[PDB]
Structure 1
Amino acid sequence: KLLEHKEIDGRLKELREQLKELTKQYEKSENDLKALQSVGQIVGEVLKQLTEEKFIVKATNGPRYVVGCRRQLDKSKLKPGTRVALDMTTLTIMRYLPREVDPLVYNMSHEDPGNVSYSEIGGLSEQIRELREVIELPLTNPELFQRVGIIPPKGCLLYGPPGTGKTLLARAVASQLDCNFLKVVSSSIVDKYIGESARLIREMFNYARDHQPCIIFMDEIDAIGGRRDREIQRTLMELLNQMDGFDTLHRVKMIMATNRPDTLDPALLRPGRLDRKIHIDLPNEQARLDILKIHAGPITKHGEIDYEAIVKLSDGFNGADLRNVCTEAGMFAIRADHDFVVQEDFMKAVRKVADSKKLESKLDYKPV
């Protein structure tokens, strides 16, 4: 006799779920419709005040006007140059805005490094720790700098041989700090129209200034950082004087990477900026073992694998190479249909990485 107890009960449950989805339809079709009765406010930038109710605004590439406060805008929160939005009809300032713009700087601030940790670094110890001395302590604990009586350092340069986790240490630092981050490709900085490189760096550094605490990181700074076509040099100047000269208060630190520290313009290498230079050497045999074990856990490694043979065969390998080894080992595994990897697969991978290394032979690299 459950038919009458359950049929209309399920009917009401289903109809209430349908009502809940149709309420979402109603709220969306009403909310966007009452959003339809709106007009885009003009975007522009203010100049000197004249009175408490008279302000000059440049309306972007259009003309410039004088206008007044709507009712609810703090006059003191307006400064010459602050970004504002105005009524289309009367041009009176509808709202102030967070200063400055640019999708490119967003793209420089919204790329994720992935999940990394300092333990997931190949035992660069000192190096890593030094980079924490120059960044972690200044941001989290400036009180110790104040008590000692020293100014926190601004920046560090990663250098040394390639493939030594050049980006990896920065990825770790970014993933282990809750602060605004700006990765930029140095070559991606420069653009043709003359002065867009300088203005783009300007906007980037204003972004960092207005989003403290921030970490700006340039990879491959030698793209434009070399000693002094000439537009590259002027871009270097823009960096070179933005990087100190107007003030120093910043809760903002710059990390730089280079595959050629020697060619870097001496002006950059100046101790006041570039506060430290961290050499990330070719990984040692013990360091190579450390890296191996760091890239070993997640593998479906099987039986027992004697890493020291890999180490003493992988002498002179860049840390990165080690990753290859592991991947190639799985290749042998997929060529053996194993759900596992054995010691001799690692031996084969090491010997093939050695085979590749001769083509990959080391550059004509000169460190400082």
Structure 2
Amino acid sequence: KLLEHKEIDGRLKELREQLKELTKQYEKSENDLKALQSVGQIVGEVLKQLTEEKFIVKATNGPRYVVGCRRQLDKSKLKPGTRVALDMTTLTIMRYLPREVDPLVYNMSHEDPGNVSYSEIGGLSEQIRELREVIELPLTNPELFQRVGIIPPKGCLLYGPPGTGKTLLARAVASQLDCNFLKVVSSSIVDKYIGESARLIREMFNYARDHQPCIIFMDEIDAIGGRRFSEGTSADREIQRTLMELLNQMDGFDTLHRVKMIMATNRPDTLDPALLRPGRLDRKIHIDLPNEQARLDILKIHAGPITKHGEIDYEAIVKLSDGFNGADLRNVCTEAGMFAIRADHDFVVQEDFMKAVRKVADSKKLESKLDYKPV
């Protein structure tokens, strides 16, 4: 009988909620009008510490200045190398920032994928154990090597076949360990301003040594688009001085805190004898193709995501194909899946595998210069 108290409480709910929400957005947008006090700044980077209260900043289009802080902007934080926000009129420092530059360091840094198992293809005989010693064990205990007093194993070279001991079967224990696994495809050091090579060597290490036991990995040591010439015209000491400054900031002169080098390639032709000394490549290692039963391994792990009957002759594909590549067995699985797409079947029959044997192992045979070992 008194629903006009609820027609007044409903007027309260609706009208007060709507006017309060409109005036609440008007409160935050009156604060956006109050941002006509917060009217702009400049941004520069500290280039040096001039005096304890002065700094030289970098206008990004041009000139360099003398600034101070606001009052309490932590003058120890503003080291040369930080980025600050600069005042508009007084031009002095207002607020620190992060950032840094070109993503050719970044797109090789943390685009880095991982394998869904330790056995992504197979053949983990020396792999698990010796890679385990060269990375994980002195990072767990440096004092064992401090019975001798030397840095951790200076890193193998995964050489052999291009593709079972080159890029595949490189990230086996890396999937398990997961500490500081970056990528360096070594084309990102051959720069434009050619002395940025050593600067990006500093940018490699001085960004790496955070995840403290670092993984210095380098696929394809001398990589740029194309092939390579010999000890004549300009197929020259770019590699040598670049690689010796690599080895400079790897070990020898400068390193810190149980960083593990890992080199992995067989493509380059020109390499340093001083690369090949004990102390920078103290241990090295070799990889066979398969031993024909690692063929069975890489096939039985390549026989993964395939609908079948369970009748796929592994001996026929192992012995009848000769690819010697997990990527070759990848192509085998791919084209056998396409020949189940052909003839319209969900299952990949063993004869689709032999069609893959035929077509893939014949298109496989359109290659020359099937051998690679430096020096």
User: Under a length normalisation based on structure 2, what TM-score does the superposition of the two structures give?
Assistant: 0.76
Which of 282, 291, 316 pairs up with 1:309?
Answer: 316
Structure 2 CA distance for partners of 1:192 and 1:249, relative to 1, 3 Å:
closer
Gaps of 5+ in 1: none
Q: Which moved more, 1:43-52 or 1:327-336?
A: 43-52
Contact residue 187 and residue 224 of structure 1 kept, 8 A: yes
Contact residue 225 and residue 264 of structure 1 kept, 8 A: no
Contact residue 158 and residue 256 of structure 1 kept, 8 A: yes
* Structure with greater helix percent: 1
CA distance, structure 2, for counterparts of residue 240 and residue 304 of structure 1? 52
Identity over aligned pairs, percent: 100
Distance apart, 1:138 and its partner CA: 3.9
Q: Which moved more, 1:333-342 or 1:217-226?
A: 217-226
Structure 2 CA distance for partners of 1:24 and 1:231, relative to 1, 3 Å:
farther
Structure 2 CA distance for partners of 1:304 and 1:64, relative to 1, 3 Å:
same
Gaps of 5+ in 2: 229-235
CA distance, structure 2, for counterparts of residue 360 and residue 24 of structure 1? 71
Structure 2 CA distance for partners of 1:101 and 1:188, relative to 1, 3 Å:
closer
Q: Secondary structure at the match of 1:322?
A: helix
CA distance, structure 1, for counterparts of residue 4 and residue 347 of structure 2? 59
Contact residue 109 and residue 180 of structure 1 kept, 8 A: no
Structure 1, residues 261-316: CA drift from partner, whole Å, max 9, x if none? 66322222333223433323211211010111111122112242221221122346
Q: Which moved more, 1:159-168 or 1:247-256?
A: 247-256
Which residue is equivalent to 1:150? Answer: 150
CA distance, structure 1, for counterparts of residue 299 and residue 7 of structure 2? 64
Q: Which moved more, 1:280-289 or 1:201-210?
A: 201-210
Q: Secondary structure at the match of 2:156?
A: strand
Q: Secondary structure at the match of 1:323?
A: helix
- How does 1:1-368 map onto structure 2 within 5 Å? 38=38, 42-46=42-46, 49=49, 52-57=52-57, 62-79=62-79, 84-96=84-96, 101-142=101-142, 144-146=144-146, 150-164=150-164, 166-209=166-209, 212-223=212-223, 230-260=237-267, 263-315=270-322, 317-361=324-368, 363-366=370-373
Structure 2 CA distance for partners of 1:10 and 1:355, relative to 1, 3 Å:
farther
- Report how many residues are paired: 368
Contact residue 224 and residue 235 of structure 1 kept, 8 A: no
Distance apart, 1:207 and its partner CA: 1.7
Distance apart, 1:153 and its partner CA: 2.8
Structure 2 CA distance for partners of 1:4 and 1:198, relative to 1, 3 Å:
farther
Q: Which moved more, 1:60-69 or 1:340-349?
A: 60-69
Contact residue 227 and residue 264 of structure 1 kept, 8 A: no
Structure 2 CA distance for partners of 1:39 and 1:187, relative to 1, 3 Å:
farther
Q: Which moved more, 1:93-102 or 1:357-366?
A: 93-102
Q: Secondary structure at the match of 1:96?
A: strand
Structure 2 CA distance for partners of 1:354 and 1:49, relative to 1, 3 Å:
closer
CA distance, structure 1, for counterparts of residue 172 and residue 8 of structure 2? 59
Structure 2 CA distance for partners of 1:226 and 1:74, relative to 1, 3 Å:
farther
Distance apart, 1:83 and its partner CA: 5.0
Contact residue 127 and residue 279 of structure 1 kept, 8 A: no
Which has the greater radius of gyration? 2
Distance apart, 1:59 and its partner CA: 5.5
CA distance, structure 1, for counterparts of residue 138 and residue 8 of structure 2? 67
Distance apart, 1:220 and its partner CA: 0.7
Structure 2 CA distance for partners of 1:128 and 1:166, relative to 1, 3 Å:
farther
Contact residue 109 and residue 183 of structure 1 kept, 8 A: yes
Structure 2 CA distance for partners of 1:52 and 1:216, relative to 1, 3 Å:
same
Q: Which moved more, 1:217-226 or 1:157-166?
A: 217-226
Q: Secondary structure at the match of 1:85?
A: strand
Structure 2 CA distance for partners of 1:332 and 1:271, relative to 1, 3 Å:
same
* Structure with greater strand percent: 1
Distance apart, 1:248 and its partner CA: 2.2
